[PDB]
From Swiss-Prot, chains A, B:
Subcellular location(s) of the protein: Secreted
Gene: RNASE1
Binding site for substrate: K7, R10, K41, P42, V43, N44, T45, K66, R85
Active site: residue positions: H12 (proton acceptor), H119 (proton donor)
Organism: Bos taurus (Bovine)
GO BP term, pick one: defense response to Gram-positive bacterium
Function: Endonuclease that catalyzes the cleavage of RNA on the 3' side of pyrimidine nucleotides. Acts on single-stranded and double-stranded RNA.
Included range, full protein: 27 to 150 of 150
Tissues showing expression: Pancreas.
Superkingdom field: Eukaryota
UniProt name for this protein: Ribonuclease pancreatic
Glycan attachment sites: K1, K7, N34, K37, K41
Intrachain S-S bonds: C26-C84, C40-C95, C58-C110, C65-C72
């Protein structure tokens, strides 16, 4: 099993590019990050900033999570992100994703020592 | 009880302004839309476009909802929105919200005849 922090990294971190490279970015990334193995993960966001910058969000603006939890944090600045969502004729095991690039604040839930992101809540 | 469509309108529609008017916008709106009555609703987004334009999203890009439902739709264009989230020392019944204005695509779940929005899923 993964640690919660490692799972966040696998699902949400892509510091290797400044933004989605093509309309096929999500198709490629959802597959290579193992998010299409057991099923098509319906929605997933990748963040194109350094791991350090994303971890730093845990020391930024404390805000509520969508579910009412109090350990969520909103980035003070906008970040380059890519939203991936199942679209068209996506059907497991033939998953298909829409790639939407944007620059927005991220909201993450943080836990542990060190206090690091363990869930991607939303972007604004 | 409200219809699902009416509840969406009450929670998410604000066509009366082109964007949040002040840092107090969310405090005012969460109260006046009855989202602080039984508890502080932790997170809520208002859309500053016409009702017609928001309803029209149900005929736009079919995408998966976060929970795996297949009746979500993403707006082709960005829309003026305001994200409201509990912050600081928000504690029922003294709710307190952060106001974040943005221009993003909206994703809504649609149902019924007429086919109209019944849930706000996310913004991109």
């Amino acid at each position: 099993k993964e640690t919660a922090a490692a799972k966040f990294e696998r699902q949400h971190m892509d510091s290797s590019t400044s933004a989605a490279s093509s309309s096929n970015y999500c198709n490629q990334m959802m597959k290579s990050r193992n998010l299409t193995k057991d099923r098509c993960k319906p929605v997933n966001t990748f963040v194109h900033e350094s791991l350090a910058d994303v971890q730093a969000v845990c020391s930024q603006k404390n805000v509520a999570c969508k579910n009412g939890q109090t350990n969520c944090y909103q980035s003070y600045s906008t970040m380059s992100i890519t939203d991936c969502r199942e679209t068209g004729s996506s059907k497991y095991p033939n998953c298909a994703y829409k790639t939407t690039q944007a620059n927005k604040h991220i909201i993450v839930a943080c836990e542990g020592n060190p206090y690091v992101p363990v869930h991607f809540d939303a972007s604004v």
